[PDB]
Write a protein that binds this ligand. Structure first.
Ligand SMILES: [Zn+2]
Ligand SMILES: [Zn+2]
Lengths: 401, 401
């Protein structure tokens, strides 16, 4: 159940010494990554977010103003051009404040939710790297909510709904929640931390979530709620984070015009459900042991043929299933039919369609799954509808499974 | 008509001094970018390309084995970690070969078409940076085809088909083709250079494409066909690129087992239709002067009420259209109906739905386009149905013109 072993077997990704801690996504692995984007983008529309894209490196003067430079200078990549030093972004927080700062905003623009699939780069030690779990180049499903102080409860409640909503799609139902409090090197007065810590504590209790206090483990700018999910091996994975930041928007001079026509600093809420999506794919690879659900499968259907008589019929089927929105390959190789079926069974292709002379003259197809489950002959349109339902619903279990 | 003024007016993007030549894509601009990605991915499916992803930095040693370091080392960014120098990738070619090298390849795996929306960073002088046309961080629609010598004539013909297929969607019909020959600073044998240059000219003749040679304007490793398009102002924009490479696969130790069971070095084709997608968005911005086709419009439909009586009926339509996959926004401000239409016309929204009490009872809408035309009262399901066809077909023309 090692993702590195399964990743090599299914041709999902690879890593090499020339880029330590950075992933070479192959076609099948990228399909999973992009399909996770589609699911996340589906939730961003449902929860009414904005998707933006910031630049990959910015001037060091920005990271000095946030205080990130004074704290994580060793963990950042630096580069220079025209006697100016730039940092490859390890976080999307300052980049989102820049977008919010363009054009005067009013209180009617809030709550303004801003998400991004930002690719970040942290200079982790090479000895600390392990597969997809600990990488240098990662992509966080970051988002920052700009809202007023009266809107904190409603925004955090929406974030908590999203944390459990997205985890339930993958089957993760056991979740442990912590609450990281102020550390010994922080910014912002005590009374700001007091109100921030109490805000997250109340929202956790109003959501009927039992939580423990991780004292001193919060970020230097905000206290955070940490969600830890458990896989089928009962292993704890810390993925979700929700923070309450009253300081960084002020340090970057973010302002909005309130109802009293007074300049006010907006509240910033950092949140990430999956965390590092590279790491989340590694968790899913081990959680399902390569048996990804149909909607996440790199190759959803393979249509083979027994002889060259059914070569035309398979091509007609591959075209039709593709137009229905199904990731389908056609295997017209010159091999034994038992050799083809085994290859795709090892590739964990959820469904494999076999076309003999009987299938062509009957207008049907024989279906077997990657589990050895044999479904027999089914009408072509019947199969298409069942795959469309299993993909739209993002169901975890297959047909007859 | 300058894309920077139109970009600021439509809230598409912005740039600042802290990131020279690097774009802050706002929400509406990023919607255009992603809609381009969807269109390109639709072409990748039709033309049967793979989509992969590579790391954003790699060891300087890898960039030295290709000669990329020798040619443009002043155009690269460099960063260091644990006494190892890494270069932020300005090209996606080395990353794809590393993916190709992983795993044993035979002749049966060719042609291997591998595409990527790679984020590149070139260290351009700040005096040359202009808007979106000249940037430091750009996203190319790169693709590399690994094929045998016999497959060259078909694979290059496939690229030429793709170039004219994609440009037809945007209405560009005046394409000017050049063939960049070898430069005086180059690598590879003369005999290899003549095979590649002659093959490109033959491929253009087979498609009945008039072209001129361009001496010395080719890459150090391959000759390339350069596609230049003309906008409605008759200005030449060089976007397309198809190169025939005999040099880099040999240098990066890429090989495939042939039919003779003897290892052979594959032929590489570098393909790029749109080029820099930030630059393409800028060209489209000036070509349409902000009147993006409905399939690219950040906000396709705006629904407005004449008074507070129609507030609820407007919201039902906003939800009904949103479920139909249309980018619909509701305008419920307390402003005269003429003021709303004038504002959203300046925002170049394709369609504007006005809802009076006559519309609430009849269940219909009043359609007004950004061109000042009036389409009268139409059934809501009829408006949705025709709007969907205009998007799925990526039609340049709007309704009733
Ligand atoms: Zn953040
Ligand atoms: Zn290339």
């Amino acid at each position: 159940r090692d993702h590195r072993k399964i990743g090599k077997q299914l041709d999902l990704y690879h890593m090499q010494e020339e880029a330590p801690g950075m992933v070479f996504w192959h076609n099948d692995g990228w399909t999973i990554f992009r399909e996770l984007e589609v699911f996340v983008r589906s939730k961003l529309k449902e929860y009414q977010y904005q998707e933006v894209k910031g630049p990959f490196m910015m001037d060091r003067v920005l990271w000095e103003k946030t205080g990130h430079w004074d704290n994580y200078k060793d963990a950042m990549f630096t580069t220079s051009s025209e006697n100016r030093e730039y940092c490859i972004k390890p976080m999307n927080c300052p980049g989102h404040v820049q977008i919010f700062n363009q054009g005067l905003k009013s209180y009617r623009d809030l709550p303004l939710r801003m998400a991004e699939f930002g690719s970040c780069h942290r200079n982790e030690p090479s000895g600390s790297l392990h597969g997809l779990m600990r990488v240098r180049g990662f992509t966080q499903d970051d988002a920052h909510i700009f809202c007023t102080e009266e809107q904190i409860r409603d925004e955090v409640n929406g974030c908590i709904r999203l944390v459990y909503d997205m985890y339930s799609t993958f089957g993760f139902e056991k979740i442990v929640v912590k609450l990281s409090t102020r550390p010994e090197k922080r910014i912002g007065s005590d009374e700001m931390w007091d109100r921030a810590e109490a805000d997250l504590a109340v929202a956790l209790e109003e959501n009927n979530i039992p939580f423990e206090y991780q004292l001193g483990e919060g970020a230097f700018y905000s206290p955070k709620i940490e969600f830890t999910l458990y896989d089928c091996l009962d292993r704890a994975w810390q993925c979700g984070t929700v923070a309450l930041d009253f300081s960084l928007p002020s340090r970057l001079s973010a302002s909005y015009v309130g109802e009293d026509n007074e300049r006010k600093v907006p509240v910033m809420i950092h949140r990430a459900i999956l965390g590092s999506m590279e790491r989340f794919i590694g968790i899913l690879t081990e959680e399902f042991a390569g048996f990804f659900p149909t909607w996440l499968a790199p190759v959803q259907v393979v249509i083979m043929n027994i002889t060259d008589s059914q070569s035309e019929y398979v091509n007609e089927l591959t075209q039709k299933l593709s137009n229905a929105g199904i990731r389908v390959k056609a295997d017209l190789r010159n091999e034994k039919i038992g050799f083809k079926i085994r290859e795709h069974t090892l590739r964990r292709v959820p469904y494999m369609l076999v076309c003999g002379d009987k299938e062509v003259e009957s207008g049907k197809v024989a279906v077997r799954t990657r589990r050895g489950k044999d479904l027999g002959s089914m009408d072509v349109n019947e199969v298409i509808e069942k795959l469309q339902q299993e993909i739209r619903s993002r169901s975890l279990k297959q047909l007859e499974e």
